[PDB]
DNA sequence: GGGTATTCGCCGTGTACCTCTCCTAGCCTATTCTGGCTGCAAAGATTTCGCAAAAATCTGCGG
């Protein structure tokens, strides 16, 4: 819930290139949950960086 | 009470041709390993097609 803004901001870049924005943010939320399930801080990286690639893939 | 007094949606809109093809956009965008699926190549198994060919069969006519 706290990271939905990242999904919205990322998806609005892809909205100008066709496809509904709402579907994009829903898929990005799916990818965000996938990243959350796989996130760790033992790596030392920022969560936003890790979630960015997941959201882009979704 | 009470009677308008606004605003808030919903709906209706002639017929019938013809020519046109015009319909179509960003590009900002990561790597890959394992396993199956499907079209194709190859092999066993099998039926279906034609000539072969001789033997039986069908048909025309004059002595």
Swiss-Prot record:
Segments for region (Sigma-70 factor domain-2): 1-58
Location within or outside the cell: Cytoplasm
Chain location of the short sequence motif Interaction with polymerase core subunit RpoC per the record: 23-26
Family: Belongs to the sigma-70 factor family. RpoD/SigA subfamily.
Description of how the protein assembles with itself and partners: Interacts transiently with the RNA polymerase catalytic core formed by RpoA, RpoB, RpoC and RpoZ (2 alpha, 1 beta, 1 beta' and 1 omega subunit) to form the RNA polymerase holoenzyme that can initiate transcription. Identified in a complex containing RpoD, the RNA polymerase subunits RpoA, RpoB and RpoZ, CRP and DNA. Interacts with Rsd; this prevents interaction with the RNA polymerase catalytic core and with promoter DNA, and as a consequence, promotes transcription from promoters that require alternative sigma factors. (Microbial infection) Interacts with Escherichia phage lambda antitermination protein Q.
Function: Sigma factors are initiation factors that promote the attachment of RNA polymerase to specific initiation sites and are then released. This sigma factor is the primary sigma factor during exponential growth. Preferentially transcribes genes associated with fast growth, such as ribosomal operons, other protein-synthesis related genes, rRNA- and tRNA-encoding genes and prfB.
The record's note on its domains: Contains 4 domains, connected by flexible linkers. In the active conformation, the domains are in an extended conformation, each making extensive interactions with the RNA polymerase catalytic core. In the autoinhibited state, sigma-70 factor domain-1 packs closely together with sigma-70 factor domains-2 and -4, contrary to the extended conformation that is seen when the protein is part of the RNA polymerase holoenzyme.
Protein's UniProt name: RNA polymerase sigma factor RpoD
Originating species: Escherichia coli (strain K12)
